[PDB]
Structure formats: structure tokens, C-alpha cells
Write a protein that binds this ligand. Structure first.
Ligand SMILES: *[C@H]1O[C@H](CO)[C@@H](O)[C@H](O)[C@H]1O
Length: 478
């Protein structure tokens, strides 16, 4: 089967995590409140009434967790820095204890021969910026994020050589500002009554625009002041479902392409070509911001690599609607498509625990080829890929460890990835499994177990290896 030999020399294997989902210690060492602290402590927002105040306590347990990575022979660990641990109020006074913590984490990883791949922003905006100017909705976020990024480059970039500025800006724009299912939970209240404020037709495009500009501002700083002496690289992690046409007809083929342009192209077309996709300009019109000439010049080419967070593939059909007033405008209607994991009464594949996560290994290879062809073969890392078990209190821990479905998922998606590189010529440089440990899965709380290690929430967060731990250890053998 698969071995390191199935991938290019030097191909990087790792696991991925995110600060708010893993760290806990939410009030420790001067940490500022974030929009997710506020959101997880608001009624109705988290399905199982939980929060990540303690999470899996990686803030105190990182050395134990690093040994768990080393036990499998991982090359790398993707983690995020909590902005509010560095600047508790977003800007202003730096929190030395935050710098000190992440230095300890980085040094502990390197002491075990594990390379740090660091995400600057994994959704945990300091609440002080949300309060001051509504965070990503205001242009001020661009300069504030860039200053925060600069502090990280300055403090950590002598050791950190792979930076991911932003995690899934598409997810944040849609879930935070169209559906209102993730922090800050804004949307058109006429579409979804649970939201307090927002506009599903306009706010997602503003937020996305500011993410793109924020990346380019940090990248400009990195390139001008840090990159020559640090010799590192910067990218972004895009959430990308693969889309297949719901029928092999010209109208549904164009629909799947359009759905992809509204998902990945929304962000990637600016970074490679200096403007949004034409289809978005045509359909979103004046609700889609325009780059200035000077902005386009800083935005185009601002990525060193493309991070791809990929789980699943849906079918996409053309959709005709031409009335939502303005009052019901939303991003899905804007696409002119509907995407679903069902065709002619049949699901596209087996499903993991998450209701959205269909197991479709071929989509990994199809997406690698799409990125290669559309964007002229940029370097790509799979910055997130994996699947979840339920959190099932009616079975024993021993039965919860038998994650044969996860093994087959990683086997099949990795086989497809290996082929995209070897047969198709895709420039993929590494792969990061979501996730090292079971953790707090945003609005799903503790109901979803994505970990290679099982976490016993009822026994002081004890970590147990699922079967997939041995499978990865065997894969990564030298
Ligand atoms: C990628 O998706 C996983 C699973 O939904 C999530 O936990 C991460 O935060 C995200 O980056």
C-alpha cells in the first residue's frame, strides 16, 4: 500500500489544530476575549450547549501532545496563534506572556524534529476589534491584522518558515455573515430569525474583500522586511469542496464550474489574476467591491503556496431565480447554483458523522488538477483533510477507538493525492490530517470527534490512540 515512497522526496506529513478548538486556558496569562468566547457563551449558538473554556487543554499539555506526534513519525504540526494572546485588545500593548508561550511551543516542536506550520488567524478575532469597528466589516482590520502578523514574523520567524495567514476566509464570510451560524453570527434577520443584525447580501462580500487585503498587507510586510533573512513562505488555507455536475450537460457543467469560482475563485482569482472572477462581477454587481489599481498590484502574486482544506465533493446543478428583492439577497442565490450530495435519489458516497461530510476520495485528485490548470501549477499543501466519528456515550472507549472508517478515508484520499502528483504532475508539497486530537468543533461542540487520538472528556482529557494512530505510524516509517 501507501508509504512515504508513494510521495515525492521531502513530502511533508503532519496533523493540524486550531487555538480556540484546542488550547483552553481562555483567561490565563492575559488572553483577551475573542468573538468565539462571546459566541460560545451566547444561548442558542452551540448545539450541545458547550464551550472551549478548557477544550482539550493543549495550552498546558502541548509537550505530551508533541510526543504523540513523534510517536507516529509526523514531520510537521499545523497550529494557530491566538491573536488575543499577543494583543489582548487587538492592537496596543503586546502581551509578553503570549509571545513566551508560543516560543515554548515552537521550541518544543523543533526539539522533537517537528516543523511548525503556523496559522495567524483561525477565526478568533479579539472582541475589542469587533466592539470598536465590527472587525472584518471595517477596512481598519487590514492594518490591524498586518501589524499583528508583523509581530509574529519578528518574534517567531527565525524558526517558523511556513505561515498560513488566514484559515478558510470563505467559511468565515458565509457562516459568519450570510448564515450567521458562526461568530459573529450576523445575517439578514428576514432570512434567519436567530440573528441579531446583518445583511446576508452585502456583508459577506465586504468581509471577503477585507480578508484578501489583509493577507496582501501582511505579505507586503513579510516580503519587504522579513523574507530575505528568514527565508520562509506565506500562504492561505482555502476551504474547497469539489463540485461535480449533477448531470453531464452543458448547463450543469457550467454550473459546477461557477460554484467553484464562487467558492475558491472568489479568493484565488484575486491572488493570481488581480481581480474577482468575471461570473461574480456579473452576478453580484455593485455588491462586489472593486480593487483599486494599487490594491490589485499588491494582491496579485501575494501567495507563495495555496493551502487546501478539502473534505468532500457535492453535485451541482444550475438554479434559476430572479427575485429576492434586495431583502432576501444571499450568497447561494448569487451563485445561480444549488449543490447537494445527492443525485437521482442516491448519495454521492458514505457519510462521516458530520451531516455535510460525504466520503468521495476522487474529489481530491479532481481538485488538485483544477488548481494546477486554473492557477498555473502553484505549490499546494493539503492543510486540512480528515473525518469525524460521533461522540457516542453508549459505547465503550475501546469500541470508540476502532476507527476503520477514518483509516479507509485517509487511505483513499491519500491514494488519490499520490496519483495527482505522480500521474497528473500536481505540485503538492505536504499533507495535514484534521485532526491530532478530538477537539471542540465550533457550533457542533463536543458532538464531533475528528481526532487520531480519542479524548476522554469524562476522565481529565485523557488521550487514547485510535486505530488510525498505528496506520499513520506504519505509513510514516523510515
Ligand atoms: C477545517 O474543518 C474542521 C472540521 O470542520 C474544523 O474543525 C477546522 O477548524 C477547519 O479549519
Amino acid at each position: 500500500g501507501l508509504t512515504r515512497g508513494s510521495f515525492p522526496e521531502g513530502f511533508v506529513f503532519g496533523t493540524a489544530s486550531a487555538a480556540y478548538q484546542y488550547e483552553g486556558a481562555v483567561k490565563e496569562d492575559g488572553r483577551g476575549q475573542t468573538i468565539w468566547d462571546t459566541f460560545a457563551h451566547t444561548f442558542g449558538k452551540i448545539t450541545d450547549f458547550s464551550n472551549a473554556d478548557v477544550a482539550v487543554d493543549q495550552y498546558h499539555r502541548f509537550e505530551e501532545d508533541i510526543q504523540l506526534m513523534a510517536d507516529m513519525g509526523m514531520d510537521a504540526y499545523r497550529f494557530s496563534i491566538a491573536w488575543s494572546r499577543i494583543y489582548p485588545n487587538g492592537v496596543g500593548q503586546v502581551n509578553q506572556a503570549g509571545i513566551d508561550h508560543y516560543n515554548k511551543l515552537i521550541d518544543a516542536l523543533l526539539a522533537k524534529g517537528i516543523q511548525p506550520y503556523v496559522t495567524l488567524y483561525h477565526w478568533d478575532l479579539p472582541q475589542a476589534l469587533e466592539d470598536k469597528y465590527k472587525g472584518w466589516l471595517d477596512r481598519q482590520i487590514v492594518d490591524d491584522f498586518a501589524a499583528y502578523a508583523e509581530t509574529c514574523f519578528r518574534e517567531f520567524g527565525d524558526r517558523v518558515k511556513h505561515w498560513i495567514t488566514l484559515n478558510q476566509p470563505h467559511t468565515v464570510a458565509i457562516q459568519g455573515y450570510d448564515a450567521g451560524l458562526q461568530a459573529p453570527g450576523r445575517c439578514s434577520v428576514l432570512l434567519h430569525l436567530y440573528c441579531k443584525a446583518g445583511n446576508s447580501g452585502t456583508e459577506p462580500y465586504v468581509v471577503a474583500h477585507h480578508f484578501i487585503l489583509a493577507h496582501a498587507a501582511a505579505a507586503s510586510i513579510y516580503r519587504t522586511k522579513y523574507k530575505a533573512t528568514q527565508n520562509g513562505q506565506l500562504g492561505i488555507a482555502f476551504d474547497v469542496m469539489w463540485f461535480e455536475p449533477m448531470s453531464n450537460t452543458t448547463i450543469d457543467i457550467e454550473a459546477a464550474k461557477r460554484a467553484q469560482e464562487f467558492q475558491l475563485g472568489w479568493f484565488a482569482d484575486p491572488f493570481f489574476f488581480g481581480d474577482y472572477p468575471a461570473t461574480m462581477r456579473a452576478r453580484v454587481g455593485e455588491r462586489l467591491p472593486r480593487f483599486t489599481a494599487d490594491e490589485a498590484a499588491v494582491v496579485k502574486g501575494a501567495l507563495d503556496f495555496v493551502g487546501i482544506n478539502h473534505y468532500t465533493t457535492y453535485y451541482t446543478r444550475h438554479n434559476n431565480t430572479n427575485i429576492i428583492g434586495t431583502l432576501l439577497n444571499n450568497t447561494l442565490a448569487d451563485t445561480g447554483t444549488v449543490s447537494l450530495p445527492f443525485k437521482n435519489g442516491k448519495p454521492i458516497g458514505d457519510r462521516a458523522n458530520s451531516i455535510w461530510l460525504y466520503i468521495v476520495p476522487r474529489g481530491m485528485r479532481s481538485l488538485m488538477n483544477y488548481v494546477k490548470e486554473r492557477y498555473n501549477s502553484p505549490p499546494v499543501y493539503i492543510t486540512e483533510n480528515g473525518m469525524d466519528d460521533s461522540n457516542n456515550p453508549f459505547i465503550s472507549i475501546k469500541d470508540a477507538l476502532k476507527d476503520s472508517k477514518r483509516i479507509k478515508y485517509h487511505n483513499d484520499y491519500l491514494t488519490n493525492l499520490a496519483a495527482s502528483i505522480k500521474e497528473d504532475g500536481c505540485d503538492v508539497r505536504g499533507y495535514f490530517a484534521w485532526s491530532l486530537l478530538d477537539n471542540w468543533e465550533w457550533a457542533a461542540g463536543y458532538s464531533s470527534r475528528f481526532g487520531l487520538y480519542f479524548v476522554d472528556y469524562k476522565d481529565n482529557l485523557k488521550r487514547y490512540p485510535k486505530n488510525s494512530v498505528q496506520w499513520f505510524k506504519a505509513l510514516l516509517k523510515t
